[PDB]
RNA sequence: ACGAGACUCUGGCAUGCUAACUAGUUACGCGACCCCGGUCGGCGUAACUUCUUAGAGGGACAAGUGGCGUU
């Protein structure tokens, strides 16, 4: 992303859109962050979505 | 008790229920068709 | 007598071309905002592939860029855009000189001066500011003003006559002084929301286009309806071409120019390889503006493209 | 009796006792022209290959 | 599960109804024309509302819609419903007639028009459908 | 420019099976240097598809409880692997892979429509199944046993590409097939 | 009409805004070590707010395109 950020302020957009095609093609990662963080733990489980074990008789 | 709207704000609270819409009444204004002018100074 | 073409599309925009501002001094060169955060500063190289490279993007502004002008000395930029700020780009380096906080709601419009001392600016918020190059706002309309958005804002080249023009979504085109900043007359007659004002290079009259699809003409000298010309749709831009007797509309998706001596269309310009064919609406021009001899049309449609229209006879 | 390939053309509905099996019209890519329903395992999207290990039964509609 | 709820429909109706005019077929326009003609305390609401709006104009470019109104009603149940033909479809030269209307028109004052041509009537009396 | 692990770079390989063509993504546009990625393969319905075969062994491998979330500890594993597999074969180690995924996939399954009738397999199913069954082959293989995953993975990859059926994937994928046909 | 949704908090975005010696970065000087440069959560002060904090705004609506559907 800083290298992208160089040659868009520092050289022509030509240079730069060549740059983002070619890294965006191969992995879309290497310029846009993945939003996934930690999701919270509940009660009633030993994290977000999984229960502590349910007893019946 | 549910306390109604007022934005004075002394009998109830100043922001109105998230689901009311209030749409203000457009005004009853008059088209136009004539060359008209208002020059002045 | 002819018919335009197009040479080429100009391609480096992700949201569609709000304004193009065209300069005397670079021709090739043009400086174009639009609806993403970037306002691009073109260079044309007029290949056999590409007619316009994009060269630098003047990133900064939070949301949408409404409205873009270029010095006439080509060395600054001044931008409106709906974060409710002004910029002025140094357009050398491609960062902000001068950034411009007065404005409540979105920028719709902005204008320099001739001399680019004088800066206008037109806002949602009903009101109308005038701003110095050092970021002073030296007076405000606010009792006599439009009773909704101003949606354009142009000035007077002839520099005898201080007066500016402002059309609205009140329906009404309001001509001001800038020496005793208090509005000269009002121009009343244009139904629907107008979305455009153009004013003559001689600074001797101004078309008003919007909603109705009727360019009406008004005198700068006397205040006075001069014709109505039919657009067919919506107008959304109009620009009177620099050298030539012919004035432009962006008529939905169509570039619709006319001669002003006789009162017929020269050309209609669209699409040649129409892909809205069913139950699709086209890519309908917003914005548009003459080059600096009077050859070029570029035009901005809400496809991403800029494309570009040269006089063939 | 071959081993045939088969395209999916129209993916039907979703049968089996649990919905486990998609029922599926499938084209037969060797004789461009002869066309069955047929029920498939898995998930399957129109335009996938399948390989049949007989051409010659044919699924009950939904 | 992007269905919008009463509250949504039922202001996007009435803000086209009351403020048609000021609305096009673009998102964030009509976005800020639902933020001045309307004091909506939700952005979320807002959208939605705005959205909805921008859905009924496209139909309404289409074609009219059952729950709304526009101004002439409109240039077509108006204006294109007083069409009126070169000759009416009344107005025929031969009028083909059944002997039996020809005798009520005999027991009628009407007993000889000359644009009645009386027919042969209809052999093999046999009109209804089988039964089962 | 050129790719994989270092060294067994991608074009070269045939995918032989045009039925398993789509869904055995390693070509061309897969081609990446590591079986590591950030992933969203799981996010939509096929987009695990447009995963590349070598990351989806990877994740596969990482299993029975005490291994889930040590993909770096199987990233290296199936590297040891591909090392093994050119070594004792002589072949491009993707090659072998993809020649075990198409081997390894049972063509036609029995299912529950009484005594449960046959039906046809999704090819996404067959490289899924595949997958699985040569990963559980590998696990099964070095569990109590001097001989290590690394070993076990590419001794899996080779007897199902080499078609020998004395692989526990091909043992298990001709179970079923025979399993299928005593009820169609 | 209540309930659902709207709402509230929270996660993700802003090289736009507001600012910071109880938060930094970058420059510069000083000092250490290696053969101009490299290292330094060694020391200090000159701009800035990307990183940091938390405020105001913005942002997403099935909005754009193609299909299916009383269209």
Redesign the pocket.
């Known amino acids: ?1 800083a290298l992208v ?1 160089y040659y868009q302020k520092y050289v022509d957009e030509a240079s730069k859109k060549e740059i983002k095609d070619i890294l965006i093609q191969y992995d879309r990662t290497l310029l846009v ?1 993945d ?1 996934r ?1 930690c999701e ?1 733990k509940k009660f009633g489980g030993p994290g977000a979505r999984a229960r502590y074990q349910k007893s019946y008789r | 008790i549910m306390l109604p709207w007022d934005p004075s704000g002394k009998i109830g609270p100043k922001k109105p ?3 009311h819409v209030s749409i203000v009444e457009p005004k009853d204004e008059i088209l136009p068709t004539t060359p008209i002018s208002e020059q002045k100074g | 007598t002819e018919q335009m073409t197009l040479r080429g599309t100009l391609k480096g925009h992700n949201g569609w071309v709000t304004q193009i501002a065209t300069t005397p001094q670079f021709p090739d060169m043009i400086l174009s905002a639009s609806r993403d ?1 970037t306002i691009i500063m073109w260079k044309l190289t007029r290949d056999e592939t590409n007619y316009g490279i994009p060269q630098r993007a003047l ?5 949408f860029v409404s409205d873009v002008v270029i010095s006439s000395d080509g060395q600054f930029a001044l931008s409106g855009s ?4 002004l910029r002025l780009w140094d357009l050398t380096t491609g960062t ?1 000189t001068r ?1 411009f ?1 007065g404005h409540t709601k979105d920028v719709l419009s902005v204008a320099f001066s001739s001399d680019n001392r004088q800066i206008v600016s037109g806002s949602r918020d009903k009101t109308i500011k005038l701003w110095n190059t050092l970021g002073v706002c030296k007076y405000t309309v606010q009792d006599e003003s439009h009773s909704e958005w101003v949606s354009c804002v142009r000035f007077s080249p002839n520099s005898s006559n201080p007066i500016i023009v402002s059309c609205g979504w009140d329906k009404l085109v309001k001509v001001w002084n800038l020496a005793n900043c208090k509005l000269k007359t009002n121009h009343i007659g244009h139904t629907g929301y107008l979305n455009t004002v153009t004013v003559s290079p001689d600074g001797s009259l101004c078309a008003s286009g919007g909603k109705d699809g009727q360019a009406m003409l008004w005198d700068l000298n006397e205040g006075k309806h001069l014709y109505t010309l039919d657009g067919g749709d919506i107008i959304n831009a109009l620009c009177f071409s620099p050298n030539r007797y012919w004035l432009c509309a962006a008529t939905g998706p169509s570039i619709k120019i006319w001669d002003l001596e006789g009162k017929i269309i020269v050309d209609e310009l669209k699409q040649e390889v129409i892909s ?1 064919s ?4 086209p890519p309908q021009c917003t914005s548009l503006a003459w080059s600096a001899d009077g050859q070029t049309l570029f035009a901005g449609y809400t496809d991403n493209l800029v494309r570009v229209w040269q006089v063939t006879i | 009796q071959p081993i045939k390939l088969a395209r999916v053309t129209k993916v039907l509905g979703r049968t089996g006792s649990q919905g486990q099996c998609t029922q599926v019209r499938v084209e037969f890519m060797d004789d461009t022209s002869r066309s069955i329903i047929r029920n498939v395992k898995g998930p399957v999207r129109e335009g996938d290959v399948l390989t049949l290990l007989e051409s010659e039964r044919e699924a009950r509609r939904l | 599960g ?1 269905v ?5 429909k039922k202001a996007a109706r009435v803000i086209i109804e009351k403020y048609y005019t000021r609305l096009g ?4 326009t009509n ?1 800020r024309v639902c933020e001045e003609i309307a004091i909506i ?5 807002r ?2 509302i ?3 709006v ?2 009924l104009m ?1 139909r309404i470019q ?1 074609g009219p819609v059952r729950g709304i109104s526009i101004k002439l009603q409109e240039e077509e149940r108006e204006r294109r419903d007083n069409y009126v033909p070169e000759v009416s479809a009344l107005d025929q030269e031969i009028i083909e007639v059944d002997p039996d209307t020809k005798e009520m028109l005999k027991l009628l004052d009407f007993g000889s028009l000359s644009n009645l041509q009386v027919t042969q009537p209809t052999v093999g009396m046999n009109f209804k459908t089988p039964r089962g | 420019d050129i790719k994989l692990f270092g060294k067994w770079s991608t074009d070269d390989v045939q995918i032989n099976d045009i039925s398993l063509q789509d869904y055995i993504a390693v070509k061309e546009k897969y081609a990446k240097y590591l079986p590591h990625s950030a992933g969203r393969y799981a996010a939509k319905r096929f987009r695990k598809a447009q995963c590349p075969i070598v990351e989806r062994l990877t994740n596969s491998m990482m299993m029975h409880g005490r291994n889930n979330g040590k993909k770096l500890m199987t990233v290296r594993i199936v590297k040891h692997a591909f090392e093994i597999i050119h070594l004792l074969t002589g072949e491009n180690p993707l090659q072998v892979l993809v020649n075990a995924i198409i081997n390894s996939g049972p063509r036609e399954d029995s299912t529950r429509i009484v005594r449960r009738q046959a039906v046809d397999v999704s090819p996404l199913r067959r490289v899924n199944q595949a997958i699985w069954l040569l990963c559980t082959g590998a696990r099964e293989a070095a569990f109590r046993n001097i001989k290590t995953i690394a070993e076990c993975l590419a001794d899996e990859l080779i007897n199902a590409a080499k078609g020998s059926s004395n692989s526990y994937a091909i043992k298990k994928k001709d179970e079923l097939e025979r399993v299928a046909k005593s009820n169609r």
Do not use: I, M, Q
């Open positions: 992303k950020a962050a939003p963080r919270s | 229920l998230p689901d | 955060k990133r900064g502004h939070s949301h709906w974060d409710g700020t902000t950034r906080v809205t069913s139950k699709a609406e | 992007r919008r709820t009463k509250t949504v077929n673009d998102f964030h976005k305390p939700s952005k979320k609401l959208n939605k705005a959205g909805y921008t859905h496209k289409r």
